Structures are given as C-alpha cells and as structure tokens.
Amino acid sequence: LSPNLIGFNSNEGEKLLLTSRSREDFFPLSMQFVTQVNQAYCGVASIIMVLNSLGINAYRVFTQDNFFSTKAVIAPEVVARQGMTLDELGRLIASYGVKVKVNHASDTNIEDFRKQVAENLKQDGNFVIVNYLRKEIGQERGGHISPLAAYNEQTDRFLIMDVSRYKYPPVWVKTTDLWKAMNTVDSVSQKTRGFVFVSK
Ligand SMILES: *C(=O)[C@H](CS)NC(=O)CC[C@H](N)C(=O)O
Ligand SMILES: [Ca+2]
Ligand SMILES: [Cl-]
Numbered sequence: 109l110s111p112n113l114i115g116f117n118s119n120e121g122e123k124l125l126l127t128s129r130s131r132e133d134f135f136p137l138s139m140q141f142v143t144q145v146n147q148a149y150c151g152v153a154s155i156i157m158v159l160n161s162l163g164i165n166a167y168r169v170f171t172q173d174n175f176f177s178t179k180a181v182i183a184p185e186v187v188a189r190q191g192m193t194l195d196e197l198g199r200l201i202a203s204y205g206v207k208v209k210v211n212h213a214s215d216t217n218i219e220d221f222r223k224q225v226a227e228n229l230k231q232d233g234n235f236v237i238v239n240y241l242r243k244e245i246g247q248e249r250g251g252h253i254s255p256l257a258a259y260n261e262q263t264d265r266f267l268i269m270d271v272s273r274y275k276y277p278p279v280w281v282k283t284t285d286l287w288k289a290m291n292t293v294d295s296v297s298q299k300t301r302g303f304v305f306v307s308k
Pocket of ligand 1: 191193239250
C-alpha cells in the first residue's frame with residue numbers, strides 16, 4: 109500500500125476501528141463482505157453487500173450470480189466490459205425498490221460529504237457506497253466502487269470495504285484523498301464520481 113493509506117490488515121488499521129465512534133456500519137457490512145467475482149463487478153459486489161445488509165428480500169439472499177436474474181437498467185454484458193457509472197449504480201439499486209440518494213461530487217463539497225457520511229455510518233438501516241478513481245488515493249486502477257464502513261474522527265479517515273479482496277485489503281483513506289478521488293470526471297458518464305446513500 110502507498111504510505112498515505114493505512115491497511116485494515118495492520119495493527120494501526122485495527123486500532124482506527126477500535127478508536128472510531130462512527131463505525132456501526134462495519135458490523136453488518138463485514139457480515140456480508142464478498143469478493144467481486146470478476147474485474148468488472150465491483151459495483152455488483154457492493155450492491156449485493158448493501159442489499160443483504162439492509163435485509164432486502166430478493167432463504168432469499170442477493171448474490172453476484174443472481175443479481176441480474178434490473179437487466180433493463182443495464183445489461184450484464186455491458187457491466188462485464190465497462191462496469192457501471194454512479195448514476196447506473198443508483199438505478200440498479202432502485203430497481204429492487206430501495207431508496208437511493210445519488211451525490212455527484214460536482215453538486216456537493218468535502219465538508220458536507222464528511223458530515224453526512226460520518227453521521228450515516230453511525231446508523232444501522234442505511235449505508236454508503238463510494239465511486240472513486242483509485243489512482244487518486246495511491247492505488248492501481250481506474251474507477252472503483254465499494255461500500256464505506258467507518259469513520260475515524262481523530263485521523264479524518266474513512267474505511268473502504270474494498271471488494272477487490274484478492275488485490276487489496278480494506279483501507280483507511282484520508283477524507284481529502286477520497287474527496288479528490290470522487291471529484292474526478294468519469295469518461296463514461298462525463299459526470300463526476302461521488303457517493304450514494306442507500307436505505308429502505
Ligand atoms: C469495478 O470492478 C469496476 C471496474 S471498471 N469499476 C466500475 O464499475 C466503476 C466504473 C466507472 N465507469 C468509473 O470509472 O468510475
Ligand atoms: Ca448507515
Ligand atoms: Cl456473491
């Protein structure tokens with residue numbers, strides 16, 4: 109990992125969870141944590157984690173293999189090649205009748221991101237998924253999607269539950285770096301990246 113990130117797979121990373129007071133969502137999300145089934149499915153993995161964490165009925169559970177079994181929003185063949193945009197992520201979640209608030213970085217700011225997300229992370233029954241450019245947080249890749257689990261107030265870092273579990277552990281990222289990474293233009297959408305709030 110680049111030195112600006114603190115891996116959850118370290119004593120320091122564990123301590124950031126232990127000293128966080130905005131960490132409720134870590135529990136149900138970790139309980140549903142999955143590895144993206146292929147290199148393009150980060151958004152699908154993120155969605156099914158959140159849907160299962162919310163208790164959404166599809167035992168009747170969501171799976172990356174059953175998610176598209178919704179197709180009218182975006183075809184699985186398109187997602188397999190290109191992933192999904194922030195707006196497509198919103199619509200895919202909404203296709204199962206769940207409430208979504210999509211926040212493009214261009215329409216908000218770092219202070220409101222931090223405040224609203226930190227408050228959300230204290231609450232069960234709702235969740236946050238981020239869409240960000242990996243290069244901007246010191247990681248390898250283009251645009252990625254994963255849920256957020258916790259916020260450490262002392263260090264101003266958010267815990268990303270990275271669904272690329274074969275490649276990276278969950279990481280604690282500085283708010284400033286995560287903001288910079290969301291405040292990037294996705295060439296597919298020609299819109300900024302950002303974050304989504306998900307609730308019943
Ligand atoms: C994760 O597996 C995929 C890899 S392409 N990423 C996304 O679905 C986000 C894609 C979107 N266009 C972006 O660039 O942020
Ligand atoms: Ca929450
Ligand atoms: Cl799965």
